[PDB]
Design a protein around this ligand. Structure first.
Ligand code: CDL
Ligand code: PCF
Ligand code: PEF
Ligand code: HEM
Ligand code: HEM
Ligand code: UQ6
Ligand code: UQ6
Ligand code: CN5
Ligand code: 6PH
Ligand code: 6PH
Ligand code: 9PE
Ligand code: 9PE
Lengths: 430, 42, 55, 352, 125, 352, 55
């Protein structure tokens, strides 16, 4: 059961007696979308300061494990431990992250962390193609709007930061009205609330800055061509649904219909996905996957693919977009029936895995928007209630003759112009 | 300059991008060319 | 592959007027060739229909 | 045929069947890998394409995994459909087709892909070279099939006739009722499965100390060491594998990886160092071995490894390690060394 | 175009029925030698067209030995045919050497491709 | 710069210039191989295509050869044209172009061909592994360039500036008048060549006994052994290399090859066994080592090796080996072992 | 390569009437196609020269 109390800070807890671990954490409603192009990467630097050697050493001496996660809409700082020592994690979180920040922002520590983060971002930008392609897709989809800033930070901006930027961001965003205290695993809600009440655990006053511009989607493309690479990596997307939309689960199911494909695994060549019937003959791709990502203001629905067949890219894109076209007009009931159970198993593993850190992140990110956490059972009935008419109604609105965003790198010379791709979003025979 | 920073396209861009209004104006111009063309071909 | 590239007759049309890669900076002086192709069809078509009445 | 299970209100339940068909038990090098790729091919009744469209609608997927010791037959699905899937798993253990055209068209092309990926990564090659020189003819059998020894379809069929038995089997199902499973277990085709000796051997393997090998590799350079661990010392090398990777140690920024592999009778503790410039590798390896030889205290890491072990025990059978409280000191006495990469610029075992 | 499994279920029934296997099989055996492919050294299954994905699949599963010999009878028939003659009488195909060596491969390939088309159109209740 | 020559009424005369630019002297692995492939490329005055049409009409050809110790500049031509060719050889030792586009278009593609051919043959790989484990950083440098260590054009030019000197040179001409050559020798561009220390070292190398290595190879299986030979024992291992290959020995039908390589200060005696079936290799290697360990008499082979040596001395500098008369007995004490092929079915050094 | 295969115009003639691989055992019934090509040229050539005199 999920129990949430608004006394003090918003305290959420999900109790699981079977687990042998307990996680206690703080989730902030600010993310990479709350920063600007001149201090971009301040959140990643804060994360790596919390994860620095001295802080991690003092934590691990007591027997605790530290996790930090940076995203568009939230920042997560989690302390995981054994069930008997769940009170010690609160003490470490109070003493280190909240009460005092002078020790963590010393000159030498800041310089070392800055040099390590610069090295990491430099390695990412050159030797991680499928993920940086998705980052550029975000950066070109939401350009000149908060949601397009990369979460790690750019190489040029990360140099200009000083400790003053970090402390300014901490003053502006680490607030009581922006925070949720989350408890996961083998702990009780009453015990957690009592433990918080015994201490003060006050973060700050409130009134975080309000953004003047809301995120917007622009049809656009960016091409980063490099002929010294062996493949071509391509990510393509349209505007999707945000969190708290009525069509959220319909979006995830429509994504699940096409699924993912790996050419080298024997089993995934026999899937009921009809798209493979066009792909398999000439080995058009090595792998693809479909995504329905949702944020607070907007979302992305699309796919990502990698291939060595540098002379047949347009055929791959054409067949994929013709499979997308089929959703509006001629989706069949068996497709939806398979999609329901595939999605239920897909959602089942996500929310019911052994690791409590994923549960903590999900619960903290959920209560910061909805105000409450949807149960597993009520999720299934909405999934089971989906019909063919709903899928057709959603697809006729979100992907029929709509603008797209594209991002590719590698031997993308075979990738045709924008308009030729944009015309594939309709059939013209219907 | 970082690749993530994108060049200024402001003088080219429309103030309000509404898909239903935008695709209707383009389709009407294409439709007009088709309507006169069908008449000429006949 | 796509039918426009797989068929024997449609692959010749594909590689000459559809997927043919053109330089991105040729000006209006390069439009003259297609105008001669248009005019060759005009002479022939207007000639077959006018050859039905000429002695 | 020893069945254990647990139940919980989770929506998704999982079922696992394990076979002691490990690579230490393969008759020819890479026989285990080929059978593992026959797993979930066509059977006599239903084809492998028949199994896909059915297990999809009921919300489940099948997997098979290869390691030094196991061939795991695992399924994760929706809670109510335990009787249906238990027959699907039993069929593959009973009446696999083993057709000649399944080896050429699917198993061989897939097995080649696994080998190709592992050859590009240098730490895997170094790890495979520590297994080979420590356990010469036990666990040191090659994991993947490359083809230096010819393996035929008969050797695959004979191996399946050897491993797929009644007494060489364990069926475990997480988050589903135990008693309901056994009624379906005692009914299915595994009830008629033949019985034989258990391939698992209680005796410990024999080990060699001081071996070295060198491989010339184009890419990064790796200086890896491996140590044999008996049954009693599994606790000491588990804390040490966590101390070096934790912030409590000074060498944590030099070390690229450290772990302990455990079996029913012992394990191999492996340490790796990786970099592009062979000069950096050469200095890093020398400082690590010099500091390890003098001594290191692992007592501050006991509470850290308890939390680390508890997370690991979720997905494993969780062998009991109550000796974490008695682990105090470590000092390196002897080890096996492997050098991969620019061997000319990398140190020798005498130099370390 | 009339498949092969379709015309084989016709066969095994006629074979088992004593009245039918006595009336028509003694009439079928004269139809084979009257056709006269045996005299050019051709086994029957070498006569079937192979330009479709079903036969191309069975021709790949065929063992090396039966594929090498199959290559020679086709070459010998091509060479003998262009000379407007026939093979010597002592090299013709007898009654017992003309065995169904390409039968099982054709049958195991259609039942796995019948299953595919019957699974692409499943209407789940 | 020590010139020796002989004369005879033969129509065809040969000229040789040797440089101690051996692979034991290469600064980086495979530097010697790359320079050897620059030899007879373009010079400042005449191109390498210019050298072809000229040396053709006068009836000569040029060659360059690489081994563990030498870079041989050899020419065989018609008798009268000694003054012309002696300038052509001097130019390459003086004013090679070393252009950047000569490394990419000719030297690198040719060097890759040499490595590819040697990798298919298993006895070469086994021999290269005996050199590496016996002489770690002396003669054991790789002979051919594969690219595990990066070699740049500057390292090639620096190596040529290091080896091409006045005092690191020997010019020998067979079947042409000595005095006539020296007048052309003292005139040519080698007269102005810089002088330096002689790269040849009088000191003996250091050796290691008992090393083993294993390589997994798809093909035939090879069980090779290698032994270090000092200066005094060159006579004993020369008779033994002929006894085993002669009909006088019973193991001659089991042995695939046997030879002794000689240098100015010692040599390596190598023995090889080769077959396709690893079972035959395993039995053959065991019988050979067992019989060698008890003892073998080489006295019947002394007259045979004298005839064998006299034929060898025609094309070599002929180091004196007058100890053939004193060679009596041999018995194997220690050796280095290398296994290539089906390593699982091949014996270990402990088993032999 | 040879000029008959390198030239743009002579490579079409090469792959249709010169280097085209034919079955080694086709009889005289396969000669009928070239006879229709011969007869098509006869009708056209004897028609252009006879169209110079027809009203
Ligand atoms: C010079 C002209 C070049 C035009 C090239 C072009 O349109 O290529 C687009 C596109 C490029 O091919 P593709 O999208 O890669 O593959 C084919 C699509 O799958 C095709 O699939 P689709 O469903 O996207 O389009 C199928 C198309 C097929 O059109 C026809 O079969 C007609 O159906 C129609 O166009 C139906 C409406 C026809 C209305 C005609 C009005 C009266 C005149 O080809 C077409 O869609 C063919 C359209 C042809 C229309 C007629 C052109 C004029 C004929 C004279
Ligand atoms: C000469 C006779 C002219 C006949 C009319 C030609 C003009 C015409 O009808 O063009 C319009 C159509 C459709 O053109 P379209 O650009 O694909 O339309 C927008 C796509 N929706 C949003 C509708 C899915 O165009 C077509 O469907 C293709 C027409 C091709 C004509 C040549
Ligand atoms: C093919 C070769 C000829 C076409 C190319 C040259 C064009 C020159 C002008 C047009 C003259 C033809 C004519 O006769 O145009 C007469 C008509 C008006 O005629 P009407 O409707 O009053 O009555 C019918 C005559 N009693 O004008 C037009 O609407 C011309 C508009 C032309 C638009 C062309 C669109 C595409 C045509 C494709 C054809 C297939
Ligand atoms: C490139 C192709 C052609 C060109 C340049 C061409 C040019 C001409 C010209 C200049 C005239 C004289 C026009 C005048 O002053 O009256 C003419 C007349 C004529 N052409 Fe063509 N022609 C072409 C093709 C054809 C074809 C293919 C035909 C018939 C199938 C044809 C039939 C005629 C006829 C019948 C006349 C006389 C009718 C008349 O002009 O009053 N022409 N042509
Ligand atoms: C396959 C191609 C052709 C066929 C089958 C064909 C067939 C015929 C036939 C059957 C006749 C009537 C013959 C008779 O009974 O007198 C005829 C007449 C004629 N054809 Fe053709 N023809 C062909 C092509 C041409 C061409 C290309 C031309 C001119 C360029 C041409 C010009 C004529 C003329 C002028 C006549 C009338 C003259 C005459 O027959 O007395 N034909 N053709
Ligand atoms: C390099 O870039 C290119 C490019 O490659 C190409 C191909 C084109 C396109 C140009 C062409 C392909 C021009 C081609 C021209 C011809 C081949 C002329 C066509 C000639 C004919 C059609 C032959 C004559 C036959 C007829 C039309 C018969 C018609 C029938 C009639 C009148 C009978 C009617 C009677 C009855 C009974 C109804 C370009 O424009 C271009 O640059 C943009
Ligand atoms: C599969 O195996 C093949 C095969 O591939 C091929 C190609 C052929 C060969 C067959 C052909 C290619 C037939 C082709 C036939 C044609 C295309 C018809 C030719 C038509 C024309 C030449 C068009 C008409 C034009 C003229 C001849 C104009 C002539 C000019 C004149 C009369 C003007 C004269 C006036 C003056 C001023 C002198 C085979 O025979 C064959 O099997 C053996
Ligand atoms: C005597 C010659 C007998 C054969 C004549 C013939 O068929 O030539 C016409 C062109 C055939 O080209 P293809 O074989 O389809 O393509 C063969 C390909 O390798 C090259 O095709 P390409 O030569 O470019 O095609 C020519 C026609 C161009 O048509 C257009 C629309 O522009
Ligand atoms: C050889 C003689 C002509 C020379 C070549 C010049 C090219 C002009 C051909 C006209 C075709 C353009 C339409 C392409 C198309 O189908 O687009 C279709 C649909 O576009 C339309 O809406 C068609 C507009 C109708 C205009 C056609 C008028 C024809 C005028 C006569 C020209 C020849 C006599 C594909 O649209 P897409 O951009 O989404 O792929
Ligand atoms: C489409 C209309 C014709 C259909 C195609 C039928 C083929 C017949 C074409 C005749 C060409 C044969 C000679 C080849 C050749 O050049 O060989 C040359 C030289 O051969 C000769 O001595 C030529 C013999 C002269 C006979 C030509 C008479 C032509 C009759 C008219 C046929 C068409 C109207 C190559 O000889 P080779 O065999 O050494 O390569
Ligand atoms: C020269 C340019 C000609 C352009 C117009 C012809 C396009 C034909 C496309 C349809 C097609 O190829 O279908 C053909 C059948 O066509 C016929 O029966 C007669 C065609 C005569 C056309 C006379 C103009 C079927 O093509 P098929 O299914 O074999 O596909 C081959 C590659 N997959
Ligand atoms: C269609 C079949 C036509 C067959 C007859 C034409 C063969 C021409 C061979 C000569 C050639 O290609 O030389 C051309 C020049 O031709 C001309 O200037 C006009 C040719 C007009 C021909 C009109 C019938 C030179 O060809 P080039 O030297 O560029 O070689 C290309 C591949 N190496």
């Amino acid at each position: 059961e999920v129990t949430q109390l608004s006394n003090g800070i918003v305290v959420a807890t999900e109790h699981n007696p079977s687990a042998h671990t307990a996680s206690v954490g703080v989730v902030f409603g600010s993310g990479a979308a709350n920063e600007n192009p001149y201090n971009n990467g301040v959140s990643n630097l804060w994360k790596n300061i919390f994860l620095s050697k001295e802080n991690s050493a003092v934590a691990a001496k007591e027997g605790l494990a530290l996790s930090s996660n940076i995203s568009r809409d939230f920042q997560s700082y989690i302390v995981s431990s054994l069930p008997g020592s769940t009170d010690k994690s609160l003490d470490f979180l109070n003493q280190s992250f909240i009460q005092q920040k002078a020790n963590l922002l010393s000159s030498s520590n800041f310089e070392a962390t800055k040099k390590s983060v610069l090295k990491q971002v430099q390695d990412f930008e050159e030797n991680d193609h499928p993920n940086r392609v998705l980052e550029h897709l975000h950066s070109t989809a939401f350009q000149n709007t908060p949601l397009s800033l990369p979460t790690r930070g750019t190489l040029e901006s990360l140099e200009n930061l000083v400790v003053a930027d970090l402390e300014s961001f901490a003053n502006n965003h680490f607030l009581n009205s922006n925070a949720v205290v989350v408890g996961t695993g083998n702990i009780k809600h009453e015990d957690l609330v009592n433990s918080i009440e015994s201490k003060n655990l006050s973060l700050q006053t409130g009134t975080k800055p309000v953004l003047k511009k809301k995120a917007a989607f622009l049809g656009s493309e960016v091409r980063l061509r490099d002929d010294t690479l062996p493949k071509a990596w391509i990510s393509l997307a349209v505007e999707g649904e945000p969190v708290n939309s009525p069509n959220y689960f319909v979006a995830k199911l429509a994504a699940q219909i096409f699924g993912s494909y790996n050419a080298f695994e024997p089993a995934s060549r026999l899937q009921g996905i009809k798209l493979l019937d066009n792909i398999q003959e000439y080995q058009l791709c090595d792998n693809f996957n479909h995504f329905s990502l949702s944020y607070k203001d907007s979302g992305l629905w699309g796919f990502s693919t990698a291939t060595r067949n540098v002379t047949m890219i347009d055929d791959l894109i054409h067949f994929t977009l013709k499979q997308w076209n089929r959703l509006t007009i001629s989706v069949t009931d068996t497709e939806v029936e398979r999609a329901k159970s595939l999605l239920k198993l897909q959602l089942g593993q996500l929310y019911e895995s052994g690791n409590p850190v994923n549960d903590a992140n999900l619960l903290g990110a959920e209560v910061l928007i909805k105000g409450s956490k949807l149960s597993l059972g009520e999720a299934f009935k909405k999934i089971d209630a989906i019909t063919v008419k709903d899928v057709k109604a959603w697809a006729g609105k979100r992907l029929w003759d709509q603008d797209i965003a594209i991002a590719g790198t590698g031997q993308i010379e075979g990738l045709l112009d924008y308009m030729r791709i944009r015309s594939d979003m309709s059939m013209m025979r219907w | 300059k970082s690749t993530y920073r994108t060049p200024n396209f402001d003088d080219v861009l429309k103030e309000n991008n509404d898909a239903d209004k935008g695709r209707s104006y383009a389709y009407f111009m294409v439709g007009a060319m088709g309507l006169l063309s069908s008449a000429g071909a006949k | 592959m796509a039918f426009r590239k797989s068929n024997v007759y449609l692959s010749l049309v594909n590689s000459y007027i559809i997927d043919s890669p053109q330089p991105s900076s040729i000006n209006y002086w390069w439009n003259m060739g297609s105008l001669l192709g248009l005019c060759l069809v005009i002479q022939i078509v207007t000639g077959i229909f006018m050859a039905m009445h000429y002695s | 045929l020893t069945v254990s299970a647990r139940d919980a209100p989770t929506k998704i339940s999982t079922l696992a069947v394990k076979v002691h068909g490990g690579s230490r038990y393969a008759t020819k090098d890479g026989v285990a890998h080929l059978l593992n790729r026959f797993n979930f091919q066509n059977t006599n009744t239903r084809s492998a394409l028949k199994l896909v469209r059915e297990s999809e609608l009921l919300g489940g997927t099948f997997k098979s995994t290869l390691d030094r010791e196991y061939i795991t037959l695992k399924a994760t699905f929706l809670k109510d459909d335990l009787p249906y899937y238990v027959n699907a798993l039993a069929d593959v253990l009973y009446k696999t087709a083993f057709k000649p055209h399944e080896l050429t068209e699917s198993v061989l092309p897939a097995a080649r892909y696994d080998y190709a990926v592992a050859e590009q990564c240098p730490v895997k090659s170094a790890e495979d070279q520590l297994y080979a020189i420590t356990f010469r003819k036990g666990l040191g059998n090659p994991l993947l099939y490359d083809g230096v020894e010819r393996v035929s379809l008969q050797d695959i069929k004979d191996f399946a006739d050897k491993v797929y038995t009644k007494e060489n089997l364990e069926v475990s199902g997480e988050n589903v009722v135990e008693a309901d499973l056994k009624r379906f277990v005692d009914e299915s085709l595994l009830s008629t499965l033949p019985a034989g000796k258990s391939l698992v051997s209680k005796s410990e393997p024999k080990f060699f100390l001081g071996e070295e090998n060198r491989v010339r590799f184009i890419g990064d350079s790796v200086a890896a060491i491996g140590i044999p661990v008996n049954k009693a010392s599994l606790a000491q090398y588990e804390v040490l594998a966590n101390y070096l990777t934790s912030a409590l140690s000074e060498l944590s920024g030099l070390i690229s990886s450290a772990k302990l592999d455990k079996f029913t009778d012992g394990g191999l503790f492996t340490l790796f160092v990786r970099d592009q410039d062979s000069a950096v590798v050469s200095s890093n390896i020398k400082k690590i071995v010099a500091d390890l030889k003098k001594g290191k205290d692992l007592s501050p890491a006991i509470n850290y490894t308890k939390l680390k072990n508890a997370v690991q025990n979720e997905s494993v059978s969780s062998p009991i390690e109550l000796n974490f409280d008695a682990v105090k000191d470590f000092k390196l006495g002897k080890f096996n060394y492997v050098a991969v990469g620019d061997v000319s610029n990398l140190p020798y075992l005498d130099e370390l | 175009p009339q498949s092969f499994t379709s015309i084989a279920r016709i066969g095994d029934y006629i074979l088992k029925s004593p009245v039918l296997s006595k009336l028509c099989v003694p009439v079928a055996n004269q139809f084979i030698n009257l056709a006269g492919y045996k005299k050019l050294g051709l086994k029957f299954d070498d006569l079937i067209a192979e330009e479709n994905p079903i036969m191309q699949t069975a021709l790949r599963r065929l063992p090396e030995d039966e594929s090498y010999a199959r290559a020679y009878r086709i070459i010998r028939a091509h060479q003998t045919e262009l000379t407007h003659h026939l093979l010597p009488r002592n090299e013709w195909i007898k009654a017992q050497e003309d065995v169904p060596y390409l039968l099982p491969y054709i049958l195991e390939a259609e039942a796995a491709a019948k299953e595919k088309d019957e699974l692409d159109n499943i209407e789940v209740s």
